[PDB]
Structure formats: C-alpha cells, structure tokens
Amino acid sequence: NLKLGFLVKQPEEPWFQTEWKFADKAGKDLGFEVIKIAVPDGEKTLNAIDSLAASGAKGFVICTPDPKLGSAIVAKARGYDMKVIAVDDQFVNAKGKPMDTVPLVMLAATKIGERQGQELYKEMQKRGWDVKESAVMAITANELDTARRRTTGSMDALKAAGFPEKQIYQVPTKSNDIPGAFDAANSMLVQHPEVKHWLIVGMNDSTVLGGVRATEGQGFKAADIIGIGINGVDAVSELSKAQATGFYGSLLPSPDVHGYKSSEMLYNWVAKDVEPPKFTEVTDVVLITRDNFKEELEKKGLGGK
Ligand SMILES: C[C@H]1O[C@H](O)[C@H](O)[C@@H](O)[C@H]1O
Numbered sequence: 001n002l003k004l005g006f007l008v009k010q011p012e013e014p015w016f017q018t019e020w021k022f023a024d025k026a027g028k029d030l031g032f033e034v035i036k037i038a039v040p041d042g043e044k045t046l047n048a049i050d051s052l053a054a055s056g057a058k059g060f061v062i063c064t065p066d067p068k069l070g071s072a073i074v075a076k077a078r079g080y081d082m083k084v085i086a087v088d089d090q091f092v093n094a095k096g097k098p099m100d101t102v103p104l105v106m107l108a109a110t111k112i113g114e115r116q117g118q119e120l121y122k123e124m125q126k127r128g129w130d131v132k133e134s135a136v137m138a139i140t141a142n143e144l145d146t147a148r149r150r151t152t153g154s155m156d157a158l159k160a161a162g163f164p165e166k167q168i169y170q171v172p173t174k175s176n177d178i179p180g181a182f183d184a185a186n187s188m189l190v191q192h193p194e195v196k197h198w199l200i201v202g203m204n205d206s207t208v209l210g211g212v213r214a215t216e217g218q219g220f221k222a223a224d225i226i227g228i229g230i231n232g233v234d235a236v237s238e239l240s241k242a243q244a245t246g247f248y249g250s251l252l253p254s255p256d257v258h259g260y261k262s263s264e265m266l267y268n269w270v271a272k273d274v275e276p277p278k279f280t281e282v283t284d285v286v287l288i289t290r291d292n293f294k295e296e297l298e299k300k301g302l303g304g305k
Pocket residue numbers: 013015063088089107146176203204230231
C-alpha cells in the first residue's frame with residue numbers, strides 16, 4: 001500500500017515514541033504503512049531519505065536533528081517527488097530564518113514557556129521561600145528556536161510575576177538530554193554558593209531532570225528545588241518514584257495530536273493533493289504532578305502509570 005516516513009531526531013524520548021504510536025493509528029485508519037526511522041544527526045537524516053526512496057515512500061513527516069538541514073532535506077525530497085511535513089522543530093535557512101513554505105505542526109512554545117514560569121512562581125510562593133536567597137537556573141539551547149521561545153517565555157513570566165531579574169542565571173547546554181543539562185547545571189551551581197533555593201527552567205523534561213540531578217549532587221534536598229519540565233510523557237518514570245524529588249511536575253502537551261495530525265495531513269496531501277495549512281499550532285497543556293499524573297495520562301489515552 002502507500003508508505004509514508006516518520007523521521008524523529010530522538011527516538012529515546014517518550015515524546016517521539018508517542019508521535020510514532022499515533023502516526024501508526026493514522027495509518028491504520030487511513031490505509032498507509034508508516035516507516036519509523038531515527039535521524040539523530042544530519043548524515044543519518046540524508047541517508048534515511050535515500051532509504052525511504054528505495055522503499056517506495058511517497059513522503060514523510062520529520063523532526064530534524066538540525067533546523068539548518070532544511071534546504072538539504074527539501075532538495076532531496078524534491079528529487080524524489082516526495083512531500084514533506086515538519087513536526088516540532090522548524091526548518092531554517094543558512095541565515096537562521098524560517099523556511100515558512102514547509103508545512104509545520106508544533107506546540108505553542110512561547111505560551112507553554114510562560115505557563116512553566118507562572119507555575120514555578122506559584123509553587124515557590126506556596127513553599128514560602130525568601131526571594132533574597134532564591135535564584136532561577138535557566139538551562140538554554142538558544143540555537144533551537146522552539147527551545148529558545150520556551151525558556152525566554154518562562155524567564156519573561158517569572159520577571160512579570162516579580163522575580164528579581166538579577167537573580168536569573170542562564171547557562172547553555174551542549175545537548176538536549178540529561179547528561180548535557182547535568183554538566184551545564186553543575187557549572188552554574190558552584191558559581192553560586194549564596195543560593196539556598198533554585199527554580200530550574202529548561203525547554204523539556206530531560207533538560208529539567210539533568211538540572212535536578214545536579215542539584216542533588218551538590219547537596220540540595222527536594223524542598224529547596226523546583227523544576228517543572230515540558231513533554232509530560234517523558235517524566236512518568238520520575239513522578240512514579242516512591243519519594244518526592246526536586247522535579248515537581250511536567251507540562252503535558254499533545255504528542256498524540258502531533259503524531260496523528262501530521263501523518264493524516266501528509267496522507268491527504270500525497271493521496272489527494274490536499275494542501276496542508278502552513279502552520280498548525282497546538283495549544284493544549286495540562287500540569288501533571290505526583291498527585292494527578294496517572295488520571296491525566298489515562299484521560300488523554302496515553303495510559304499506563
Ligand atoms: C516539543 C518538542 O520540542 C523539541 O523538539 C524537543 O526536543 C522535544 O523534546 C519536545 O519538547
């Protein structure tokens with residue numbers, strides 16, 4: 001039957017695993033086969049497309065490991081008469097500007113970043129921390145736009161709620177995973193012995209979790225640390241632990257919607273030249289904590305907790 005690709009940069013994250021599961025559902029519903037491929041670097045990305053072409057695939061959905069590979073992906077796909085849809089990470093040209101012509105499906109990055117900071121501040125208030133001895137550790141991935149709108153949004157929200165701007169410290173992470181964030185947080189932590197309580201800002205669950213793991217290694221106990229991640233599905237193993245940790249909760253978006261809808265739209269495009277909207281922004285978000293994560297995932301059909 002019709003074969004369609006679903007290429008993701010980080011197959012190890014439950015976030016992409018979930019996109020793959022719902023693309024499969026779209027396939028069963030619409031009558032297509034989904035070829036699931038991992039594209040963790042640029043070389044694998046370009047090679048994977050050649051592979052799709054040998055398999056007979058008519059197009060693919062892709063979350064690129066690098067926005068700057070956009071030109072190349074488009075050139076190759078065009079050579080093979082394949083339609084492409086981007087999911088989560090937008091393609092950019094050489095200069096860093098958006099390839100607005102490639103359909104994109106993504107979450108509302110600024111808005112979810114802002115919700116992260118609002119919830120950080122509220123939980124801080126609930127605990128009664130003295131602002132004078134508190135600080136925000138912002139672990140950033142500024143070369144990736146979607147990551148950058150989320151952390152800027154969170155810092156903006158904290159500043160709007162009145163968190164002192166001079167107590168907001170930013171540190172770049174070399175990889176968007178636990179090991180990179182861990183390293184990044186550890187180097188910021190020893191620069192600030194004066195701080196007794198930390199707010200950890202990061203664009204996704206893995207980033208926040210690396211930050212939390214580093215604070216633990218420097219002697220902070222869970223009461224003095226608040227980290228709220230983004231993805232939701234990626235935090236289930238943390239929230240499932242017996243004891244509470246500095247990872248307070250996660251903002252759960254809709255990876256299920258991202259997997260089904262991008263796949264369904266690709267299909268309609270390939271099968272009926274039905275042109276997708278250029279930009280699909282999904283605004284859904286719920287805060288999951290130790291207390292409600294299993295109810296909330298089951299309510300969304302992302303069952304098991
Ligand atoms: C919305 C998604 O955006 C980026 O691609 C991140 O790398 C993912 O973990 C997920 O948070």
